[PDB]
């Protein structure tokens, strides 16, 4: 039961790329007809906070990654294909703009 | 540009405890009046999927963690206090029940 120091929490939760379990439906929202397997994939994506109403944590460098995913159409069997997903290598706190 | 094998994706995204950036407002929803700093904290929490409509990823062993967080009331300055947060040590896919 050791407390985490304010400086350290602040540091640790500041905007950065963190491994994120993302739903494949979120990434591929036009595929309504399919059920995916697994439902989700791990991706390096921006996360944490900027603690400043004017700033957002956003990717400044991206890259791609490709995985075999099983697409399951009802009464039509399962085909395993390759799907691609963006990943975030660098994140910054940057000004929101409307 | 190397592909991830289906077996490996499946394995890697299956229900497990993963470091998660959680908004403190989510964890402490009665504190409307305060702004927290940082907005969020990193916690080990259950995540990923069970790929089976009948199952949910849920914690089977929990523990606590304590952090200094800055509470900011408007026109009333900032006080740094200790807040506690549940963490998830073990996760299982378990049957949903209504």
């Amino acid at each position, epitope marked *: 039961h050791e407390v985490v120091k304010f400086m350290d929490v602040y540091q640790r939760s500041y905007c*950065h790329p963190i491994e994120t379990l993302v739903d494949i439906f979120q990434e591929y929202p036009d595929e309504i007809e399919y059920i995916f397997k697994p439902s989700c994939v791990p991706l390096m994506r921006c996360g944490g906070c900027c603690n400043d109403e004017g700033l957002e944590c956003v990717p400044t460098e991206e890259s791609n990654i490709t995985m075999q995913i099983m697409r399951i159409k009802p009464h039509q069997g399962q085909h395993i294909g390759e799907m691609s997903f963006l990943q975030h290598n660098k994140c910054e706190c940057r000004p929101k703009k409307d | 540009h190397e592909v991830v094998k289906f077996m490996d994706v499946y394995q890697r995204s299956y229900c497990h405890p993963i470091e998660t950036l959680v908004d403190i407002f989510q964890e402490y929803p009665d504190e409307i009046e305060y702004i927290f700093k940082p907005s969020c904290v990193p916690l080990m929490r259950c995540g990923g999927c069970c790929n089976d409509e009948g199952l949910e990823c849920v914690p089977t062993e929990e523990s606590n963690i304590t952090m200094q967080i*800055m509470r900011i009331k408007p026109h009333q300055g*900032q006080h740094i206090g200790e807040m506690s947060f549940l963490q998830h040590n073990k996760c299982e896919c378990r049957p949903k029940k209504d």
Partner: antibody, heavy 121, light 108 residues
């Protein structure tokens, strides 16, 4: 044009006191964290402590706790390192430096020139 | 406290050599390692932050990598003015401990 300017370096008696001062321009120290780092002559850098001027939060090295006090003056845009009960092994060049939103935390991209605090009878 | 162990303590390389300097953390540091260069009697200069990003306006021959507890600064083509002492620093847990620095010499 961000710079940090230090002053206050000098000679001091063992046991005595000194207030290093770190004057910012080009940004507001309020909207950032100021750290202090020192370097014993010939040795490597050691972190002294930091301050979050918005709130006055401070965090110090165990090697320096209870003796040193970091402080800030948002109106005068200036941080301060207050040295008490000084020792021989406290003889070093003292740096202040700042962390802002441009970099991820504690990567400090602008520093002061450094003053030499030398503790001697 | 987290101990940071740099290696080598000193190295001597020729101009245009690719030089690497490793830094090893006693526990995991998420990726919060930064690399500073220090020319004698001057403030350190930030080179790399968050393990792997180039600090603004630093020459690209400077490159950082590593994940876990093992990290590396790489100068890809050592230049006459790269002569300096390089330090790594860990930001994950106070105190913010530095490596003991690697003292790079140009061999001519």
């Amino acid at each position: 044009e961000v710079q940090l300017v230090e002053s206050g370096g000098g000679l001091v008696q063992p046991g005595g006191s000194l207030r290093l001062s770190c004057a910012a321009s080009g940004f507001t120290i309020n909207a950032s964290w100021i750290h202090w780092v020192r370097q014993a002559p010939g040795k490597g850098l050691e972190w002294v402590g930091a301050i979050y001027p918005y709130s006055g939060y401070t965090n110090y090295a165990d090697s320096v706790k209870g003796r040193f006090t970091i402080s800030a003056d948002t109106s005068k845009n200036t941080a301060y390192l207050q040295m008490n009960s000084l020792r021989a092994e406290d003889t070093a060049v003292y740096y202040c430096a700042r962390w802002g939103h441009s970099t991820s935390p504690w990567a400090m991209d602008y520093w002061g020139q450094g003053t030499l605090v030398t503790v001697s009878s | 406290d987290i101990q940071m162990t740099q290696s080598p303590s000193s190295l001597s390389a020729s101009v245009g050599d690719r030089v690497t300097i490793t830094c090893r953390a006693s526990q995991v540091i998420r990726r919060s390692l930064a690399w500073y260069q220090q020319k004698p009697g001057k403030a350190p200069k930030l080179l790399i932050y968050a393990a792997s990003n180039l600090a603004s306006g630093v020459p690209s021959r400077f490159s950082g990598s590593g994940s876990g507890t093992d990290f590396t600064l790489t100068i890809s083509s050592l230049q006459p003015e790269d002569f300096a002492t390089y330090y790594c620093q860990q930001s994950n847990t106070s105190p913010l401990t530095f490596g003991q620095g690697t003292k790079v010499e140009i061999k001519r």
